[PDB]
């Protein structure tokens, strides 16, 4: 009767509460997706347990074994019933899982340390003093691997063979590399993550230029699940009632430090 | 074998070509949705005929008869197989038709004649010298009828009982009212329409403030149609290949006059 909700530790979507080591079960976590899961379970009327994905990945298919990892893999292999997380809606994932209509709209973006002389992806692609990368194993890395746009092909050619690796294990590792690099590392990541980090101390980073593409996050269910329909309607209801706006303001802007 | 694609005359989504009276069938029309229908039919491999909806409406359900009008009605009653148009994804429509993942992201917005002293919906709601309205019978009008947010409740209370009516038959009628009103009429409409009109001569209007909500347009099919799945994948492929970006630039910005 209790459904397993897979998700990932990614601020401010899911975070440990301050005293989480004294707490158990769902009470360990807080954040936008923890709130979204509660609101959705309320409409769909289900009990659920949040489960942080073991491998800390979003979901990609290994080109050799064809095995899905990450939250996507948890759904595909029947280990979770729903993923409530900043999981980007993408073609290759829509072939194997179902997604709700998007609960947030976003785009890939550039994060720089303040004062870095970069205003656009064209600006990063034409030089080499400033290194740049993305999260390993997610949709941003696939965006660059698959692009046929000249500027993005140029960036992919640079990242794919950069040494030491510019592909990071977590977004937090990318942000910390930006922060420690004295302006010599820029990070390509989703605009929602970029906008959150910009409002957090030490307020030393900023999003530059417009977004590179336009996409969304969706709540994901196994292909054919009976949860898919009521979840989708739940998301649309929450959107129309202004709850999603309210949550984004709560988690991004109401605490802003910058 | 030829599928009926319902759509609506709305610039720059679907427009008559300059010499359309000498032309027949699909060649009569041009615009973003005409291009989108061609790209989708290419992936899904179907022949199709564009059909401008008789009543020139998007789709609403009559509260008395429960009958759907507009493009939504064409789908629900089996008179078209697909709607390719700036049809907003909404809860009440998702109960009766299917939508693709969104091909465009947008929000409700305010259109003013340049120089009008309004910078926000709060600004419109607190005065009464400047009248304001929306398209009749679409999702923007429903947004205000259904809102429980104070500022929007206040605006709905004003519009619902304004005389002469502030609800317009087409977006073009709203724009022309803005233009002719000497600053005394503002129009609430979708950001994509607002951004297009701002780049068109006589360049006397502008979008003010941020958007009131965040939603999207989707390609619509009857509930349960076998087209739904291949269309959705087609849209996602076009999104990821940068075709949707390309089309938005073609139809909004590459001709811009302002
Ligand atoms: N939401 C992304 C994960 N990821 O977060 C970023 O900022 N880039 C990136 O690839 C996914 O679902 O794969
Ligand atoms: N896309 C809207 C129609 N409409 O266009 C606007 O700008 N407002 C409005 O209601 C719909 O699908 O109902
Ligand atoms: Zn800890
Ligand atoms: Zn004519």
């Amino acid at each position: 009767r209790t459904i397993v909700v897979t998700t990932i530790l990614e601020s401010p979507y899911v975070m440990y509460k301050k005293n989480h080591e004294q707490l158990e079960g769902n009470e360990r976590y807080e954040g936008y997706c923890v709130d979204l899961a509660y609101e959705i379970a309320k409409h769909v009327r289900i009990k659920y347990k949040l489960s942080i994905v073991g491998d800390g990945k979003y979901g990609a298919r290994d080109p050799e074994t064809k095995i899905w990892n990450g939250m996507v893999g948890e759904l595909v292999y029947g280990r979770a019933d729903i993923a409530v997380a900043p999981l980007t809606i993408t073609l290759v994932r829509e072939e194997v899982i179902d997604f709700s209509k998007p609960f947030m709209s976003l785009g890939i973006s550039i994060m720089i340390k303040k004062g870095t002389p970069i205003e656009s992806a064209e600006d990063l692609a034409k030089q080499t003093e400033i290194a740049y990368g993305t999260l390993d194993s997610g949709s941003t890395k696939e965006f660059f691997r698959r692009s046929k746009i000249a500027v993005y092909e140029k960036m992919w050619s640079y990242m794919k063979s950069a040494e030491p690796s510019v592909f990071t294990k977590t977004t937090a590792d990318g942000v910390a590399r930006v922060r420690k690099s004295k302006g010599k590392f820029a990070f390509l990541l989703e605009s929602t993550m970029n906008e959150y980090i910009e409002q957090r101390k030490p307020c030393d980073t900023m999003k530059v230029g417009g977004n590179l593409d336009s996409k969304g996050y969706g709540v994901a269910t196994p292909k054919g699940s009976a949860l898919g329909t009521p979840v989708n309607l739940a998301v649309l209801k929450l959107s129309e009632q202004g709850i999603l706006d309210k949550l984004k303001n709560k988690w991004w802007y109401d605490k802003g430090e910058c």
Side-chain angles (χ1 to χ4, degrees), chain A:
Chain A
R1 303 300 306 182
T2 300
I3 70 136
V4 179
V5 175
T6 188
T7 191
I8 181 141
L9 282 159
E10 184 71 83
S11 308
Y13 298 95
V14 179
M15 306 172 291
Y16 288 119
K17 269 188 207 156
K18 168 85 143 46
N19 52 159
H20 70 98
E21 296 174 5
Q22 312 190 294
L23 303 166
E24 317 175 302
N26 300 347
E27 168 153 47
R28 293 168 291 178
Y29 313 110
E30 63 186 344
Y32 177 104
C33 284
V34 168
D35 284 348
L36 179 54
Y38 175 87
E39 292 293 341
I40 292 159
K42 176 198 305 166
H43 284 294
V44 179
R45 293 175 183 178
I46 50 182
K47 301 179 300 303
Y48 66 93
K49 171 99 187 292
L50 302 175
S51 178
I52 302 309
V53 65
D55 64 9
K57 308 174 162 299
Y58 284 88
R61 182 174 80 122
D62 176 25
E64 287 164 340
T65 64
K66 312 289 185 38
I67 293 165
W68 288 88
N69 57 27
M71 289 175 287
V72 176
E74 298 301 294
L75 291 167
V76 164
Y77 301 112
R79 299 181 300 265
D81 312 276
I82 190 159
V84 170
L87 188 67
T88 304
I89 296 172
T90 72
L91 186 53
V92 293
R93 291 167 177 173
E94 192 76 87
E95 300 179 315
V96 295
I97 59 176
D98 280 341
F99 280 107
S100 72
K101 295 299 184 301
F103 63 84
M104 198 169 294
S105 301
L106 55 307
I108 288 162
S109 70
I110 302 154
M111 177 189 285
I112 54 168
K113 198 173 173 54
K114 278 178 189 178
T116 294
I118 287 305
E119 291 171 59
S120 85
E122 292 62 22
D123 285 350
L124 280 173
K126 60 167 200 180
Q127 54 82 61
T128 58
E129 229 153 43
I130 301 156
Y132 49 94
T134 67
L135 184 70
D136 213 358
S137 312
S139 62
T140 299
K141 182 179 193 203
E142 181 76 356
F143 173 81
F144 285 96
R145 173 194 287 120
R146 303 302 186 194
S147 186
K148 301 306 173 182
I149 302 173
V151 56
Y152 308 141
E153 283 178 329
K154 176 163 203 181
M155 293 170 70
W156 174 244
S157 187
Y158 156 80
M159 298 187 277
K160 189 189 23 144
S161 82
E163 192 70 22
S165 186
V166 295
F167 301 111
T168 192
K169 174 164 166 51
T170 65
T171 72
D173 301 333
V175 168
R177 190 159 157 181
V178 173
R179 282 174 167 159
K180 295 169 78 54
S181 277
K182 259 84 175 201
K184 304 291 202 266
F185 182 74
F187 195 57
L188 286 148
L189 76 176
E190 293 166 339
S191 60
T192 41
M193 281 76 153
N194 201 350
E195 289 161 340
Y196 169 74
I197 295 305
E198 196 172 38
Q199 312 267 315
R200 302 306 286 182
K201 290 203 304 205
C203 325
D204 53 355
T205 64
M206 68 188 280
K207 167 194 340 181
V208 293
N211 296 341
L212 271 43
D213 66 357
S214 283
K215 53 208 193 186
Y217 304 140
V219 174
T221 43
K223 205 181 219 39
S225 172
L227 293 186
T229 294
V231 169
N232 186 47
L233 298 170
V235 163
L236 294 167
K237 196 137 156 185
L238 297 163
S239 175
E240 279 170 32
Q241 292 183 337
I243 306 311
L244 301 177
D245 289 345
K246 166 185 275 62
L247 294 171
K248 171 178 190 75
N249 285 142
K250 179 179 183 193
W251 290 104
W252 270 254
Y253 304 112
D254 297 346
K255 292 148 152 96
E257 297 164 349
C258 304

